[PDB]
Design a protein around this nucleic acid. Structure first.
Ligand SMILES: [Mn+2]
Length: 566
DNA sequence: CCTGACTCT
DNA sequence: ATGAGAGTCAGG
């Protein structure tokens, strides 16, 4: 716990070396337009703390931040890059990101501060952020010397840990995955988040007014059918109405009481009309609470834009997630919810939304990895396995994905409301047709037991230390992760590479088009209307060619005046 | 704060 | 026991 540094009052030349650990500290969880509270730089010449007022208004320091040839090692460089964009400053030359390095080494550690990453290498001359800032209502930036010491210690830790982290990544064959995939993607995600998506608030507000009226009507109908007023949004009060007052069968219980899951209620429709109304009510109520009210709460009023954060170091499989707001779960399944997407519009007049989605991506990946000749030929014939297995097609999608990822006879039976005996026979016939898939799934489970981890196409890893558990439930869930993770994660790898390849192609061709969102196997862009034709060729080609498998990748695309129309 | 609901891939 | 990966919401 002994570390010297300069608490600097001005930027000096020796701070601007061509290699440095850099900390640009943003304490708020949502870093969009958030205060930068302090800066630290550690390099060959020493350790320095700078006040952002000073540093960020200094033309040489701003120039250095933006100079790609001056290399910066950081932790969560996207947070810094976006926070700096909101300050009108461009950040370039990030050559190492400890957050992403830690994530690739082991996603289960849930590393989300420098101290947590440092623990992976038994480095402890740095405190956890939470210890320094405090939690909840007590959260605060400490006195300058305390803050300064913390930021310097974090920079010093990044400085010392780069080599040990790079060496372990290299040993895992994950060095390129970091340097050539995740780090380049980080800068692309920063651009998307800062761009944001424009919202039609007039439209959304009108939808909200009309939805409130409809909710009230459905609500009263439910009370009439029930013979009583109650809170429909309380599974507890609802369970009393359904299973005590109305005396409906109890199909399922949870730890806290009667289940009122949508699966259960749907099965209760032969007994009472009220369950279909309740299902409808809870759909409408989610639309209003989340996609009208919740969405309007996060719209920046002056620009009418929403700015999501794509968490790149969270999911256990290599996927992204999207928060505040989540723009990866906007309704589409039912027309009533899908209408929400009419409120998502282009950020300029005479621009349009373009959306492209990989078809059956995880099934194509699986064909390649499992080397199932039958499935592999299906895709070479450009057939549609979803339609072949076949609302029908949508319901058949869940069956295909259910079956390959280990659904049981009980689960398939409950899903299709068919006989458990019949469900079992359908699963047996399915593997009959795709014997390579069955073989693969048996083999990957055994491999996970032997190695302790599974891997994706671009060498992403997930450790599965529970997979030999003597406990049936613990073991079985781990085995199913062994079946699913390599495929979901390989599909993640591919779309990440496609985003990188696509941005480069957009720059080369000097298009104004740019990415707005990624939704797991879909890419959403906006562009001038004149660029649509080019996009129809470019976007799908770049996506389809991101990797070369034993089967072709296929990408569907559409464009229009709103996201709904795309 | 956790649970169980609805939302997506 | 009973495909897997996510986030937000109201209720309690
Ligand atoms: Mn798709």
């Amino acid at each position: 716990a002994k570390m010297a540094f300069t608490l600097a009052d001005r930027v000096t030349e020796e701070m601007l070396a061509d290699k440095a650990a850099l900390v640009v500290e943003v304490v708020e969880e949502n870093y969009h337009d958030a205060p930068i509270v302090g800066i630290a730089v550690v390099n060959e010449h020493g350790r320095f703390f700078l006040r952002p007022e000073t540093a960020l208004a200094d033309p040489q320091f701003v120039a250095w931040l933006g100079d790609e040839t001056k290399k910066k090692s950081m932790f969560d460089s996207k947070r810094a890059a976006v926070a700096l964009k909101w300050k009108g400053i461009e950040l370039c030359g990030v050559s190492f990101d400890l957050l992403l390095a830690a994530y690739l080494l082991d996603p289960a550690q849930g590393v989300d501060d420098v101290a947590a990453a440092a623990k992976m290498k038994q480095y402890e001359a740095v405190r956890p952020d939470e210890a320094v800032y405090g939690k909840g209502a007590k959260r605060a930036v400490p006195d300058e010397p305390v803050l300064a010491e913390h930021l310097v210690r974090k920079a010093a830790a990044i400085w010392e840990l780069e080599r040990p982290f790079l060496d372990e990544l290299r040993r895992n064959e994950q060095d390129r995955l970091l340097v050539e995939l995740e780090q380049p993607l980080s800068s692309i995600l920063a651009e998307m988040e800062f761009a944001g998506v424009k919202v039609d608030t007039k439209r959304l507000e009108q939808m909200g007014k009309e939805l409130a009226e409809q909710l009230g009507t459905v609500e009263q109908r439910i009370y009439e059918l029930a013979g009583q007023e109650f809170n429909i949004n309380s599974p507890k009060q609802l369970g009393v109405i359904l299973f005590e007052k109305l005396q409906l069968p109890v199909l399922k219980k949870t730890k806290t009481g009667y289940s009122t899951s949508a699966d259960v209620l749907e099965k209760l429709a032969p007994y009472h009309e009220i369950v279909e109304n309740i299902l409808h009510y809870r759909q409408l109520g989610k639309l209003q609470s989340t996609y009208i009210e919740g969405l309007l709460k996060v719209v920046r009023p002056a620009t009418k834009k929403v700015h999501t954060i794509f968490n790149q170091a969270l999911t256990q499989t290599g996927r992204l997630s999207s928060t505040e707001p989540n723009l990866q779960n906007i309704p589409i399944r039912l027309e009533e919810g899908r209408k929400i997407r009419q409120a998502f519009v282009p950020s300029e007049s005479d621009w349009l939304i373009f959306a492209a989605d990989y078809s059956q991506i995880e099934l194509r990946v699986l064909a390649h990895i499992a080397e199932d000749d039958n499935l592999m030929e299906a895709f070479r014939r450009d057939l549609d396995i979803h339609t072949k297995t076949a609302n029908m097609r949508r319901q058949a999608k869940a069956v295909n994905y259910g079956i390959v990822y280990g659904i049981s006879d009980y689960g398939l039976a409950q899903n299709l409301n068919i006989s458990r005996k019949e469900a079992a026979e359908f699963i047996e016939r399915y593997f009959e047709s795709f014997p390579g898939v069955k073989r693969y799934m048996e083999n990957i489970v055994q491999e996970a037991k032997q190695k302790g981890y599974v891997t994706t196409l671009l060498h992403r890893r997930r450790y599965l230390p529970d997979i030999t558990s003597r406990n049936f439930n613990v073991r079985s869930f781990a085995e199913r992760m062994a079946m699913n993770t390599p495929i979901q994660g390989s599909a993640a790898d591919i779309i990440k590479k496609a985003m990188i390849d696509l941005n480069a192609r957009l720059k080369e061709e000097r298009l104004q088009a740019h990415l707005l969102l990624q939704v797991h196997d879909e890419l959403i862009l906006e562009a001038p209307k004149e660029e649509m034709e080019r996009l129809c060729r470019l976007v799908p080609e770049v996506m389809e060619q991101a990797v070369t498998l034993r089967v072709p990748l296929k990408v569907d695309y559409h464009y229009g005046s709103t996201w709904y129309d795309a």
